[PDB]
Amino acid sequence: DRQTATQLLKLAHKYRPETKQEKKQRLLARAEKKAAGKGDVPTKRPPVLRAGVNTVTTLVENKKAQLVVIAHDVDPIELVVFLPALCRKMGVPYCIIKGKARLGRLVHRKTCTTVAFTQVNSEDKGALAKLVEAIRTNYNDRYDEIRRHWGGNVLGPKSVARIAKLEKAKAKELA
Amino acid sequence: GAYKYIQELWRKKQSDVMRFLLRVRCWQYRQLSALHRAPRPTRPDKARRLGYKAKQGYVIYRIRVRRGGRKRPVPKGATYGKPVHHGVNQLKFARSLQSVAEERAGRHCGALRVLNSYWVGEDSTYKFFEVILIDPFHKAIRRNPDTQWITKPVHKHREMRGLTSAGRKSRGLGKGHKFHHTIGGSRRAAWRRRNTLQLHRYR
Amino acid sequence: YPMAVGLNKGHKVTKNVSKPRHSRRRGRLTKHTKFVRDMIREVCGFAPYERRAMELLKVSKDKRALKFIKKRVGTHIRAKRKREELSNVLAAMRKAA
Amino acid sequence: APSRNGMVLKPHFHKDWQRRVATWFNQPARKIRRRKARQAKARRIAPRPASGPIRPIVRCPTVRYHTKVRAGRGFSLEELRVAGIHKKVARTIGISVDPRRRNKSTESLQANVQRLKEYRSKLILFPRKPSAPKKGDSSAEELKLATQLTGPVMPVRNVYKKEKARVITEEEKNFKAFASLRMARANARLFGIRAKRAKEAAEQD
RNA sequence: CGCGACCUCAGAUCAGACGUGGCGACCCGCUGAAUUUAAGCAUAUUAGUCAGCGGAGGAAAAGAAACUAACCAGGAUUCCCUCAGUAACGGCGAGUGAACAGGGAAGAGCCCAGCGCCGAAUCCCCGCCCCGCGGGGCGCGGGACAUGUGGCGUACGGAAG
RNA sequence: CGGCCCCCGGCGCGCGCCCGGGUCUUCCCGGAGUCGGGUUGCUUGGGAAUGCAGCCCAAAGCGGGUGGUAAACUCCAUCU
Ligand SMILES: [Mg+2]
Ligand SMILES: [Mg+2]
Ligand SMILES: [Mg+2]
């Protein structure tokens, strides 16, 4: 639902990946201070979110990811269909978001089909841990039932209306 | 990580998931043209194990081929020869259908060079193949010296000569005791060497 | 007393023992790949010929069950390895319950 | 069409054979052509030897030929490994490498290893500008010739043993006969059968 | 109802490129007879040749083993001499008929997808410049491609840390 | 043989790129409507089917292919 998905993108917004504009200056600030002080470790932890099906699958089956946002409208759906079944087995929480265009704008691209959460900030772990029980209630714990749930198979409205009109005639037959 | 799962999921194409989306789109493919330019590969693992990369210059076409063997194009089934040549209706066309499918893809686009292709659905009448093509004159292809081989002019129209892995299966060549009907060069290059009279000068 | 014909044949030379050529270790299971194929037989399922096979292999008999896999998958030597891996699905479904 | 006592013949001239005829009138014209493809290659290279790299000692297959020694393709990894030289450095030394060859004998393994160390001790390299790692002074006093011929260390050299003279002793003029062939020839073919009758008396109880 | 994204697609005398046809001796992919021979004729032979059709190049095709072998084992392809008119095929008739060792010519090997690893570390296009001839860039700033995966180290002779 | 004019392959100043090898330990390791089987045509010396092609069925992972008489059992060889 969109209230959780807006809270999720609020959390993922400050973990935005590096763009080529800020990649120019980030290699400057590393190099101007190394030219001035030679820092042995200036930044111990730059945190970021990963992107890409082929990168996420490496993180889940190594159990390095902490929450796997997964998209909805992948055109060859077999690119993604294994991944909910796999996050159950490695126990990583996953959530299906609406629209692969919208999480593609997080990573400054068009479509990106998956992102992952590995190292959140420890002061903002408490926002990631807030909605993660709201998520693995809905996806991981329900896996015995969401694997059973068939889809489709409803007739069209011009043909289910004549179903109801036969049932009302059967309802008018009895009383 | 991803593509090993996509491979193994594809290799079971009778299970209820996979035989659904192999025919929810075999319908969708059937409604289009005989050949149609796909914007992106419909199975990106199998394209890239056949030589595809996702950059400017490569292009996929899915094209359609009508299934079945060939009928001998002869008026009223009258072939006018000895009775071993009354073969109107059991004739089988010794080159493959995928090699036919690559052939009428690189024929429409003669500015394009063809690498190879793969299978994306079959109905009872039509059979659908995605054919991958390469523009020899784009600078992402004309640089990158591990790609410069195809822009070298001996590779003009590779399937009309039978050079791709779909098409080279029909020539019957390879090493072995099972394949030395073509043990020099090609099939008729063996025949010319077996049937030449090699009379020397002092004989 | 070495000789050319018989049961101890040939010029008697000494063996060079060595670690085998690497391409001969080709179809091993390599446990990570065992994980991938076993993760995918529960997202995807069984083929329609082999769900009909295990409904003979639990009740009807096995000899008519192998003669069924003899016909659909090709050879005899492929039909037994398919049959004993269906009986191990049928054991893990029933006998681990 | 036949006649008196002669041969019955199958000439294969029932096919249009005048089109596929190959007459060798250019064959002196090509023998003087591929001499020039060797001479203008030999001076083209270097003082590096003509007729290419060094080949192994290789014994032929197929019982008719298994008693002789042939030059092979490449020395291979097992034989390169013991000699100490790297598998990709070996072909700029002048040593051909055939990685698909196997060693399953040890006598022929050590033969090509002895061959390959013998080569390197009669090889002189040229450092570019004279630093010379693993190489010494002036180049073997200008290397005693320039360029070799048709094989470096005479690659066939099919050699046999002397085995001069013995005295015919007892147990040697007594035993190892024709009968030892015929009995060993029979024991190879009655081997699987007699091990089947042996199972039959084991299930006899 | 409007707006934004993305996917699928359109249009244009868009900017910049490309393909077409010829020649066809040799070469590559298919298609393909009959005369003739068998003293007749159907299977066979002629012949996978003639004609038909499509693609190239200065050569093409092949080519680094899902090989040959069966013993003391050879080691990509192509060409020659043999094997050999032989094993085999065939109204077992007419006829047809390869290969492996062996001797030579020539000799040269390699790369990717995948599995992981590196903050996409990669490419195209435009603009002004370092500074240049006969124009191609490594250097600078913008627009795209690209995570549905570009680039690096890697390929079964093992590889990586 | 000489003299003329142009064109070409390769020594040395300035760009560009630049840690390999051995031993051990740990981890990685592969191409699917494909192989294969059926049947049906063609082809081949290839014969209980050498090759190819259609249609149907359709894999495995100490697996797979080959080992020239169909099959079951087994061992070994060889290739990937
Ligand atoms: Mg594009
Ligand atoms: Mg003569
Ligand atoms: Mg030309």
Curated annotation (Swiss-Prot), chain A:
Location(s) in or outside the cell: Cytoplasm
The keyword Ribonucleoprotein is assigned to this record: yes
Example of a GO cellular component annotation carried by this entry: cytoplasm
Residue positions where N6-acetyllysine is found in the record: 10, 130
GO BP, one annotated term: cytoplasmic translation
GO MF term set: cadherin binding; RNA binding; structural constituent of ribosome
Main location: cytoplasm
Linked residues for Glycyl lysine isopeptide (Lys-Gly) (interchain with G-Cter in SUMO2): 10, 38, 158
Keywords (A to Z) from UniProt: Acetylation, Chromosomal rearrangement, Cytoplasm, Isopeptide bond, Ribonucleoprotein, Ribosomal protein, Ubl conjugation
Keyword Cell membrane: no
Organism superkingdom: Eukaryota
Subunit annotation: Component of the large ribosomal subunit. Interacts with CRY1. Interacts with DICER1, AGO2, TARBP2, MOV10 and EIF6; they form a large RNA-induced silencing complex (RISC).
Role, per record: Component of the large ribosomal subunit. The ribosome is a large ribonucleoprotein complex responsible for the synthesis of proteins in the cell.
Disease per UniProt entry: Chromosomal recombination involving RPL7A activates the receptor kinase domain of the TRK oncogene.
The family this protein is said to belong to: Belongs to the eukaryotic ribosomal protein eL8 family.
This protein's name: Large ribosomal subunit protein eL8
Native organism: Homo sapiens
Lineage: Eukaryota, Metazoa, Chordata, Craniata, Vertebrata
Location of this fragment in the whole protein: 88 to 262 of 266
From Swiss-Prot, chain B:
InterPro entries: Rbsml_eL15_core_dom_sf (IPR024794), Ribosomal_eL15 (IPR000439), Ribosomal_eL15_CS (IPR020925), Ribosomal_uL23/eL15/eS24_sf (IPR012678)
Gene Ontology terms describing biological process: cytoplasmic translation; translation
UniProt entry keywords in alphabetical sequence: Cytoplasm, Diamond-Blackfan anemia, Isopeptide bond, Lipoprotein, Myristate, Phosphoprotein, Ribonucleoprotein, Ribosomal protein, Ubl conjugation
The protein's role, per its UniProt record: Component of the large ribosomal subunit. The ribosome is a large ribonucleoprotein complex responsible for the synthesis of proteins in the cell.
Record disease entry: Diamond-Blackfan anemia 12: A form of Diamond-Blackfan anemia, a congenital non-regenerative hypoplastic anemia that usually presents early in infancy. Diamond-Blackfan anemia is characterized by a moderate to severe macrocytic anemia, erythroblastopenia, and an increased risk of malignancy. 30 to 40% of Diamond-Blackfan anemia patients present with short stature and congenital anomalies, the most frequent being craniofacial (Pierre-Robin syndrome and cleft palate), thumb and urogenital anomalies.
Gene3D superfamilies in the cross-refs: Ribosomal protein l15e
Cross-link Glycyl lysine isopeptide (Lys-Gly) (interchain with G-Cter in SUMO2): where in chain: 82
Organism: Homo sapiens (Human)
Top-rank taxon: Eukaryota
Compositionally skewed regions (Basic residues) per UniProt: 168-181
Subunit field text: Component of the large ribosomal subunit. Interacts with IFIT1 (via TPR repeats 1-4).
Chain spans, region Disordered: 164-185
UniProt-recorded Gene Ontology molecular function terms: cadherin binding; RNA binding; structural constituent of ribosome
Name this protein carries in UniProt: Large ribosomal subunit protein eL15
Modification Phosphoserine occurs at: 33, 96, 99
Pfam families linked: Ribosomal_L15e
One term under GO cellular component: ribosome
Record lipid sites (N-myristoyl glycine): 1
UniProtKB/Swiss-Prot annotation, chain C:
InterPro entries: Ribosomal_eL36, Ribosomal_eL36_sf
Gene Ontology BP annotations: cytoplasmic translation; translation
Keywords: Acetylation, Cytoplasm, Ribonucleoprotein, Ribosomal protein
Keyword Nuclease: no
PROSITE patterns associated with the record: RIBOSOMAL_L36E
Subcellular location(s) of the protein: Cytoplasm, Cytosol; Cytoplasm
GO CC annotations on file: cytoplasm; cytosol; cytosolic large ribosomal subunit; cytosolic ribosome; membrane; nucleolus; synapse
Broad class of the protein's primary localization: cytoplasm
Top-level taxon of origin: Eukaryota
Residue numbers carrying N6-acetyllysine: 58
GO molecular function: RNA binding; structural constituent of ribosome
Cited function: Component of the large ribosomal subunit. The ribosome is a large ribonucleoprotein complex responsible for the synthesis of proteins in the cell.
Subunit structure: Component of the large ribosomal subunit.
PANTHER family recorded: 60S RIBOSOMAL PROTEIN L36
Protein name: Large ribosomal subunit protein eL36
Gene expressing this chain: RPL36
Curated annotation (Swiss-Prot), chain D:
Listed GO MF terms: RNA binding; structural constituent of ribosome
Primary location group: cytoplasm
Covalent link Glycyl lysine isopeptide (Lys-Gly) (interchain with G-Cter in SUMO1), residues: 173
Coiled coil residues, start to end: none
UniProt keyword annotations, A-Z: Acetylation, Cytoplasm, Disease variant, Dwarfism, Isopeptide bond, Phosphoprotein, Ribonucleoprotein, Ribosomal protein, Ubl conjugation
Residues with the N6-acetyllysine modification: 15, 176
A Pfam match: Ribosomal_L13e
GO CC terms of this entry: cytoplasm; cytosol; cytosolic large ribosomal subunit; cytosolic ribosome; endoplasmic reticulum; membrane; nucleolus; nucleus
Organism domain of life: Eukaryota
Subcellular location: Cytoplasm
GO-annotated biological processes: blastocyst development; bone development; cytoplasmic translation; translation
Entry annotated with the keyword Membrane: no
Tissue: Higher levels of expression in benign breast lesions than in carcinomas.
Modified residues annotated as Phosphoserine in this record: 51, 76, 105
Gene3D superfamilies the record matches: 1.20.5.110
Cross-link (Glycyl lysine isopeptide (Lys-Gly) (interchain with G-Cter in SUMO2)): 122, 144, 173, 176
Disease: Spondyloepimetaphyseal dysplasia, Isidor-Toutain type: An autosomal dominant bone disease characterized by early postnatal growth deficiency, severe short stature, genu varum, platyspondyly and severe epiphyseal and metaphyseal changes in the lower limbs.
Family named by the database record: Belongs to the eukaryotic ribosomal protein eL13 family.
HAMAP family named among the record's database cross-references: Ribosomal_eL13
Protein name, as recorded: Large ribosomal subunit protein eL13
